[PDB]
RNA sequence: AAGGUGAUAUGAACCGUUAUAACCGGCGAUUUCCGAAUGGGGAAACCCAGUGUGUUUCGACACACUAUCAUUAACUGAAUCCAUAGGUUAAUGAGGCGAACCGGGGGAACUGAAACAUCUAAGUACCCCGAGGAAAAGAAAUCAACCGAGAUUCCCCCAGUAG
RNA sequence: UGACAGCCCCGUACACAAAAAUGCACAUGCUGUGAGCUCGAUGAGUAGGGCGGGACACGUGGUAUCCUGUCUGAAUAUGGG
RNA sequence: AUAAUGGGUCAGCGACUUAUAUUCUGUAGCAAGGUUAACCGAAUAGGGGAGCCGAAGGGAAACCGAGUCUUAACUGGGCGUUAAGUUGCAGGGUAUAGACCCGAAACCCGGUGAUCUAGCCAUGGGCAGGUUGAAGGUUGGGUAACACUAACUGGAGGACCGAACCGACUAAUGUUGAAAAAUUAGCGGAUGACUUGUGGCUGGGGGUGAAAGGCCAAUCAAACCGGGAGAUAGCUGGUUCUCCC
RNA sequence: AAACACGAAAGUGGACGUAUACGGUGUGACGCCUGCCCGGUGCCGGAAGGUUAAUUGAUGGGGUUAGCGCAAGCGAAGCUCU
RNA sequence: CUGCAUGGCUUUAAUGUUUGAUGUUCUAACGUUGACCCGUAAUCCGGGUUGCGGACAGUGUCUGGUGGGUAGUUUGACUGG
RNA sequence: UAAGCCAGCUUGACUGCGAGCGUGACGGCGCGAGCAGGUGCGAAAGCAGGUCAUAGUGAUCCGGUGGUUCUGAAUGGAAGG
């Protein structure tokens, strides 16, 4: 569960980095709260074009 | 029933075995939980009775796919 | 087709003999009530309805339809405006029964070991779900042993051998 | 059939018969369905592993192999069993 | 003879089977060979020699071979080298099966039972007649007022005597009964933890139990019906015509 | 959301009760009373220390072999048995 | 003797991390047999809002303890019974 | 002739075999001259394969250890046997 950010956020905030977050942190808060999204190897290209 | 809506995991029967190998019937049943999942693609939460792994699948494949299944298969949800 | 109206079963009254007597076969028609029973109920073969129809005697009764689930559509439509859930209608299909064979979910103990736990009986008996005329299996991430074979299934060997 | 019938009766061998409905084959009509050539693609919460069981003739045994309740988790043809 | 078992009598039925393996005997075929299995089939033929047995043994084995193993090695020693096998058919044994027939007490599985009884739930019914006289009350007496006291009134109680009703202490009768649990004479309770009609709920290692292992349909230290099932029985019983050694 | 009981579970009883309540156990109206023993077994309390499960996997040893060699033997890395 | 103003690729321990133990805080999984709202004239369920609780509780797999609550069994023969 | 007593030197309490016997239902147990290799004591003939003899003991299975080119599931090894 690496995911890519969206806004700032915690000791990793950056509007679009590849972090390595704990899954529960990921699929219970950030994504449902729209602060990140999974890095599904398709996603590692849209925020790897900027 | 204790069936994982994602994997179809259900209880399975096996044995106990003592140090003397006495067999006593028993069941392994799955690590169910039931969990509010955000879809966004429907602006709603859906509670699936899900196994861990069921979760780990949802993590990987991603919810909507999994929801294509279930619906593809007829699961209520 | 010259004789017929099933049997116990006579009798009555009939029907027929050159083709609508009977009898046999094909396809139709009728097909009360209960029973999956399906309009609601219920002590099975009964009680009671909603809605539609029906009456030169247009009341009350008779008949038809109204179960549930699924799929699809249509129309409707909360908390919440959107949107959903919910609700009505409609079209389809399901439901119950049935000898074995078949696949699947569960799964004994007696017994054997000259006792008994491991082991056996045995994945047997039994319960359950499902399907077909057969079921299942099946087109090598298989064997072989440096030579080669070429899906699955069944029969005889291999052998009561190796383990 | 009044006792044991090739020639009494009903049959049997053999040869024939279907107005209708049907099983089975073909042949087509209607519906639904896709064929063909070029260039591609090649089945990941999987294989494998840890724990617990179960299956394989095989009782965990030096035990390959298969299945998975549980926690994990690759390579991708110069690759993998 | 037994006073040890079994048989009232007759008739009919009633117990060593079947299949597949293996070995021995007989017999048959062929013979250092014998024989095919499935299957094909002109279907008891014919085909099919996959295969099985035998012709070589010894050694755990590699391996060697009329020898081989043992040991560094045998004067040796062990097992072998000299006699034929094999396939049918009949029979004697054995193996696997219910394996000669009948018989348990039980264990497991799925069902059917609270029309008896236990307890509980709901809704209805019953208790002739006669006693006892609790709290309380009233009025006099009595207290400073209460206390207390006498009458009268009142009508308490798992209260009293006693029918219906509910019980079941004694005895006799009955014991192939009138009755698989009663009759007669006495006995207990009889406004209560009473008793009763109807209907409901609880299920088998489970119910219910004012507790006896009681009751759960004349069944209870684990109900009944069907099944596993021909459980198993080193025990008891029985085991059928004749003659010869 | 009691303990507790039926129940794979949902649930239900306990109770539409709430410590003057409810379950369990022993004793058994009343009167006068109920002495000694916590070593054993049980129960209650006990944040120290000793021993201790799955788990985690340090280290040591073995197998294989690129390489080294005439071979005796050594054995990188990986994979493995332990 | 060195420094305080001035003169031609570590143990004695601490800033960024990947990682355990304990303690506080948070909400966002999870609980709610609090309250209100809708489905809905409904003490079931669901959805919704909210308060409470909160990474606890509970559950799955694994695991040490306890375990006649329950089950299957064993508990020798000789013998002057 | 001591098997009894004392002393010197010693490892025959040796390895491979074993004619022939005894004794057991059997599993087994016992006695044994002699052959081969190597050894001790003795000048030598010789004697020694434990003790004056008869008790001093435990089948198989499972497993440990050392040895062993005998086996090694494609082949070389290894595991295992
Ligand atoms: Mg009806
Ligand atoms: Mg009905
Ligand atoms: Mg036995
Ligand atoms: Mg080739
Ligand atoms: Mg492929
Ligand atoms: Mg006499
Ligand atoms: Mg007699
Ligand atoms: Mg009753
Ligand atoms: Mg009284
Ligand atoms: Mg009285
Ligand atoms: Mg009775
Ligand atoms: Mg019997
Ligand atoms: Mg049996
Ligand atoms: Mg007493
Ligand atoms: Mg017991
Ligand atoms: Mg037993
Ligand atoms: Mg005895
Ligand atoms: Mg191999």
């Amino acid at each position: 569960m690496q995911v890519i950010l969206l806004d700032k956020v915690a000791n990793l905030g950056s509007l679009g980095d590849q972090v390595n977050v704990k899954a529960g942190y990921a699929r219970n808060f950030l994504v449902p709260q729209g602060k990140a999204v999974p890095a599904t190897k398709k996603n590692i290209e849209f925020f790897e074009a900027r | 029933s204790r069936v994982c809506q994602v994997t179809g995991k259900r209880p399975v029967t096996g044995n106990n075995r003592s140090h003397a190998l006495n067999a006593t019937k028993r069941r392994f049943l799955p690590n169910l939980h039931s969990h509010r999942f955000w879809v966004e693609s429907e602006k709603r939460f859906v509670t699936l009775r899900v196994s861990a792994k069921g979760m780990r699948v949802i993590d990987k494949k991603g919810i909507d796919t999994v929801l294509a299944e279930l619906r593809a298969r007829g699961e209520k949800y």
Side-chain angles (χ1 to χ4, degrees):
Chain A
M1 197 71 71
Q2 287 233 330
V3 332
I4 311 171
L5 297 163
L6 253 78
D7 287 63
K8 228 62 177 67
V9 184
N11 301 7
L12 51 78
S14 63
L15 308 182
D17 296 24
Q18 295 301 345
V19 287
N20 182 37
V21 74
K22 292 179 192 172
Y25 191 9
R27 295 300 290 274
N28 273 347
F29 187 56
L30 296 175
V31 173
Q33 202 76 64
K35 294 184 167 184
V37 61
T40 64
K41 304 166 193 174
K42 164 185 178 183
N43 306 139
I44 73 176
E45 297 181 4
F46 190 103
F47 288 80
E48 214 272 329
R50 192 196 72 80
Chain B
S1 292
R2 304 188 226 263
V3 179
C4 176
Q5 286 180 277
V6 172
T7 48
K9 273 179 180 298
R10 55 191 334 97
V12 309
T13 39
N15 286 343
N16 258 322
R17 319 308 283 205
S18 64
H19 287 19
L21 296 185
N22 314 122
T24 4
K25 273 303 192 194
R26 79 104 128 195
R27 308 162 84 218
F28 307 70
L29 69 204
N31 193 345
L32 275 58
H33 267 82
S34 119
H35 189 284
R36 278 197 304 103
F37 287 100
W38 187 248
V39 288
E40 189 122 53
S41 35
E42 314 189 10
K43 251 70 188 78
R44 177 171 65 96
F45 274 118
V46 287
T47 45
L48 302 177
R49 206 173 174 202
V50 157
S51 57
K53 193 188 188 69
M55 269 205 62
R56 309 211 330 138
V57 149
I58 293 170
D59 285 7
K60 193 202 265 299
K61 272 188 180 52
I63 308 173
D64 282 322
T65 315
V66 177
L67 283 174
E69 328 170 342
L70 315 183
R71 180 163 21 77
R73 180 170 28 177
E75 268 268 30
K76 36 179 296 188
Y77 119 78

